[model samples]
Target: REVKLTKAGYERLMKQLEQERERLQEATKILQELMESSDDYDDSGLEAAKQEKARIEARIDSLEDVLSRAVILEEGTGEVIGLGSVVELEDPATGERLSVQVVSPAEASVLENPMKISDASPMGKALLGHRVGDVLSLDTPKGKKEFRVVAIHG
Candidate 1:
């Protein structure tokens, strides 16, 4: 799969990665403190601490991968929809507007509201190399659906 990111989006993503790195570092420290303080506690507390550390480490690895590929777009690319673009689409079935940011798969956390989509997904694949005013159609298990590009802003 191919991915493209504007210079603006690259900078934004880098800033976010740095912030996340700091947070995970702090979380690691907290886990360490918990472990040290849990000497009087049962073995279950230690197990929980280990699990938390493992999870935090996994997240840190993923964030590092995302940060390594933050490349910006050059000038003269007009209305091109790619990573970092806030893509707006009209759902043909409901005629409602749906918007999401095209981010890397590792960054795909719905709770974070970043709307990160994988390049391998049907929607993401269809959107690649597409420009504003383009219409995309996809065949899902549920059936066929169409999307019209309404807006693309970085």
Candidate 2:
């Protein structure tokens, strides 16, 4: 499936990439400063700092990969619901509602949080070619799950 992004969304993504990069760099700097100031840093403190740095670096790398592959699609697609759309969905059985900002594979998160997932994964594929109000079911590791597409916006 082809992924599309608005020119504005593409530009916004570029800025976000830069901001996240700066964040990662700042995090590294903080770790370094902590290390430098410590006359006798405990092993656990040093290890925790290093772990935190690694997490930030991982996110930065993911964003970088997405930026590298992001393609700007022409405007006025008329709600095809590919990339750059904030998607709201409802669970069929439990009636639980959730929303996800459809973004680059690297920047895709589980809605309002930083945990990332790949857009090429099973659920992402199910979302493709689907319109608002469409219901989709996919097989998960636990069982089959269903989602009703509630809304989409660029």
Candidate 3:
């Protein structure tokens, strides 16, 4: 299926594909060497390595397919939050502030904290099409959480 992504997201995937490809090649060589170097090789170890290689290959393929059909989103200038929008949100109750960039699922990384959020996520859905100073609420595992849109940067 075709996916929408920002130009940055496409570039990130391309870089990831390059890294995974290298790892796959190296893993393939390691597996081949292990098979040839021993008559009674550890089957479990070999199986694990094969599985890892398969996982890497599958991810690479998925990334390639996504990139092939990806629609790169241009930066938005409108008031409402949308894809490629860097939004500043605040938790009115605690006065906590967070900045999140709405992006495709492939580009969303938890490691980045509020830096990246998938457009398909509940928060993303609630924020999209909402303008600054808009109060939004969404249900989560812990119950309903509310946030206010403080600002939006394209």
Candidate 4:
């Protein structure tokens, strides 16, 4: 299936794939050397290289798959509330603030800490398509709450 991602995220993954691809090549070469140098019951070097190559291959495959399936959103980030928007929301009641990066499911919480909200979340639905100065309501187990879009970052 396909996945969503911001242009920034797409480029980020692009660079990441390049790095991993390099690592995969390095592992492959090391594994080849280990294979050529192996004797009998003491091929620990070969064993280690085989494990390392497998790990790098898995990552390379995964990254290539994601990059191939990514539907990259390149526009309308800071222009409006949408994927790739680095946004700040203000709670009107007590003036608390939430800073989050609006991201696709694949990109969400790559680093989490009151941040990197996914488009699938309830809060994600509420905030998406809304612009700065737009206020939206949220539903929580505690109670209903309101937040205003205060800023969008590049």
Q: Stretches of candidate 2 above 4 Å error?
A: 1-3, 78-154
Descending-TM-score candidate ranking: 3, 4, 2, 1
lDDT against the true structure, per candidate, is 0.60, 0.60, 0.69, 0.67
Could you list the CA RMSD of all candidates, in the order they appear?
13.7, 13.5, 13.7, 14.6
Give the range of the ten consecutive residues with the poorest summed lDDT in model 3. 1-10
- Ranking 1 against 4 by lDDT, winner: 4
In model 1, the worst 10-residue window by lDDT is 1-10
Top candidate (TM-score): 3
Q: What is the TM-score of each candidate against the true structure?
A: 0.45, 0.47, 0.50, 0.48
Better of 1 and 4 by TM-score: 4
> Which residue pairs in candidate 4 collide?
none
Model 4 alpha-carbon drift over 4 Å, by segment? 40-43, 76-154
Worst 10-residue stretch by lDDT in candidate 2?
Answer: 1-10
User: Stretches of candidate 1 above 4 Å error?
Assistant: 1-77
lDDT of 3 by residue, 12-125 (tens): 556667867999999999888877777876868688888978878876676576566556655443377779788887543343677888899899976796689889987768
Q: lDDT per residue, candidate 2, 38-147, as tens digits?
A: 89756676787788777667755654554444455445444656766667765533436777655567766665542333468666676765665455666777966555
lDDT of 4 at 58: 74
